[PDB]
């Protein structure tokens, strides 16, 4: 009912599109015998296509006048409803993974600034060090906030500028 959109089960265009896809698949599915390989391939394709169309319509995702699904990205409209998975939790999942990556890369590039000729370590990596740091970053929100309160990430204005 939000934005004039209707749940995607009551969309005549959505079901018409599903029927269209199934007809287009079957018209060239009827070209092969039930025993050959291409026939089984088309059978499995139709299987997961029907599965596409069935599994989407659960917990509610709005389809518009076109019958296609439309993602709701506002927190608050995903709340007070059931749309928190459209894009609200994927945001936090990507933030977690991107943190993880940046944290690991930063701690690597910092721990390499101490040894002689660090440039080599950037073309010939320290594989065991990278593997160790790769399996230690999945608590980075804890380490990031308290390393921020710490101050070990703010450079005290000792860099090259021109102005």
């Amino acid at each position: 009912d939000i934005a004039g959109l209707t749940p995607c089960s009551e969309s005549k265009a959505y079901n018409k599109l599903e029927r269209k896809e199934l007809k287009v698949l079957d018209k060239r599915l009827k070209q092969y015998e039930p025993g050959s390989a291409p026939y089984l391939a088309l059978q499995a394709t139709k299987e997961r296509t029907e599965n596409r169309f069935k599994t989407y319509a659960k917990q509610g995702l709005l389809c518009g006048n076109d019958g296609l699904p439309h993602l709701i990205s506002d927190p608050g409209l995903a709340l007070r409803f059931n749309h928190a998975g459209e894009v609200f939790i994927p945001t936090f999942g990507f933030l977690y993974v991107a943190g993880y990556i940046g944290h690991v890369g930063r701690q690597y590039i910092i721990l390499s600034k101490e040894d002689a000729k660090p440039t080599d370590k950037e073309i010939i990596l320290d594989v065991p060090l990278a593997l160790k740091l790769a399996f230690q970053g999945w608590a980075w929100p804890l380490a990031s906030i308290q390393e921020l309160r710490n101050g070990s990430l703010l450079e005290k204005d000792e860099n090259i500028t021109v102005s």
Binding site: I2, A3, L5, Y14, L17, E21, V24, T49, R52, F53, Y56, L62, L68, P69, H70, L71, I72, S73, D74, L77, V87
Partner: peptide, 16 residues
């Protein structure tokens, strides 16, 4: 691939 249902369509809730 012939499956328009699998595309991403962000609903502009703000302008609406």
């Amino acid at each position: 691939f012939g499956t328009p249902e699998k595309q991403i369509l962000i609903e502009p809730v703000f302008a609406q």
